[PDB]
Structure formats: structure tokens, C-alpha cells
Design a protein around this ligand. Sequence first.
Ligand SMILES: NC(=O)c1ccc(S(=O)(=O)N(CCCc2ccccc2)[C@H]2CNC[C@@H]2NCc2ccc(C(F)(F)F)cc2)cc1
Ligand SMILES: [Cl-]
Ligand SMILES: [Cl-]
Ligand SMILES: [Cl-]
Lengths: 99, 99
Amino acid sequence: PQITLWKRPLVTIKIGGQLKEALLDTGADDTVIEEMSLPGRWKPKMIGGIGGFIKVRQYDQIIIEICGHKAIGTVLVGPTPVNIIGRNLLTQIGCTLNF
Amino acid sequence: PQITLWKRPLVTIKIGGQLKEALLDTGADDTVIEEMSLPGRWKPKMIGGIGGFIKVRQYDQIIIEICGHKAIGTVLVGPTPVNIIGRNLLTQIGCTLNF
Ligand SMILES: NC(=O)c1ccc(S(=O)(=O)N(CCCc2ccccc2)[C@H]2CNC[C@@H]2NCc2ccc(C(F)(F)F)cc2)cc1
Ligand SMILES: [Cl-]
Ligand SMILES: [Cl-]
Ligand SMILES: [Cl-]
């Protein structure tokens, strides 16, 4: 698909058996999801930007379905205002910026 | 161009006759630039980031070139981790997400 940017590029994802709405975010290095349970070990991480930093839990080797495309990678879980699909998973679905 | 996301999508912009580096950020509603001098009056704006909300200065109808493409629009000035080209100007230059 081709997604314009007149509004936020929100999509439905499936993660940990749950459906969520998430933002395709080329400015994010990492994928960041609101509080939920995920399998496996985790370690703490701090991520930041405008407004400062938040503490998140880093889970590795997590599968996410995004628009029919399955991708695996690291997912950070914490008090993010919006669910964010970052570059680490955008690459895996072959997402590019074009102009 | 077509820009992949294996690295941060950093490009050169020109604003106020000066070249700067900026991030093409589909997760940003707005364009936010580090402290600099812009012409005209400004208005107050509050934007929310990953870590919380902050105040910035809003300048309208500012001339800016992004990767060689001319745009004219709203530029916010404030304490941003990096210069951010958000959706307001990504749309002007015809930027889409594709996968
Ligand atoms: N309204 C707006 O225009 C707006 C909204 C939010 C932000 S933001 O939170 O600062 N901001 C830009 C931060 C980009 C950046 C930060 C630090 C170093 C390099 C690059 C937002 C907007 N889109 C991307 C970024 N998304 C939040 C975010 C921050 C960090 C990470 C992690 F570190 F994990 F990767 C993931 C997600 C900036 C502008
Ligand atoms: Cl990853
Ligand atoms: Cl003010
Ligand atoms: Cl604008």
C-alpha cells in the first residue's frame, strides 16, 4: 500500500495475541507499545525525546503482524502516549519513504 | 527519492539560508527545529512527545527546503532532540509511506 500523511499513519497490529492501533513512525528507532504482557526475559531501558525520557521493558524476538506482514524484533513496553511501530520493524515489512 | 529505514532518515534542509540536518518523521504531526532566528511574530503551542508535553514557538509561512524540495509552512522552534520534519511539511513535498 501507499499511505499519505494528511493524517497520522495509524494501522492495526497484532501482538501477543492482542489487536492494537499503532503509528507507523519513521522518527522512532524502536517499537514502543503501551503496557501489556509479553513472553520471555526483559531488561529495563530508557527512551526519550521531546518532553524527556520514560522507562520501558525491552523484550526481544517478538512477533508482530502489521498489515498482513509478519515481522520479528525487539519491542519496548511502557507508558507511551501512543503505540509506535519504529524503524526496527518498519524495515522488515519493506516500508520506505518516497517523494 | 526512495528512502529505506535501516538508518535514521536524516536529510539536509535549508532554512534562513543555512543548511541543517533533520529527521523525516512520520510520527511527528509538526515540524520542530532547534533554537534559531526566524522572522515575524510567533504564537504559543503545546506539543506532546514521548516523555511529556512542552511549549514551543510557532512561526507560520516559513520558507524551507527539504532534500532540495521547496516548502512553505509552519515551523515550531524549541528544545527538540534533533530537527524534525513532520507531517505538515512531509505532505507538502509529496512524501508517502510505501510497503
Ligand atoms: N508533535 C510533534 O511534532 C512531535 C511529537 C513527538 C516528538 S518526539 O517524541 O520527540 N519524537 C521524535 C523523537 C526522535 C528522536 C529522539 C531522540 C533522538 C533522535 C530522534 C517522536 C516522534 N516520532 C518519533 C518519536 N517517537 C517517540 C519515540 C522516542 C524514542 C524512541 C526510541 F528511542 F525507543 F527509539 C521511540 C519512539 C517530536 C515531535
Ligand atoms: Cl529489533
Ligand atoms: Cl508562551
Ligand atoms: Cl504547515
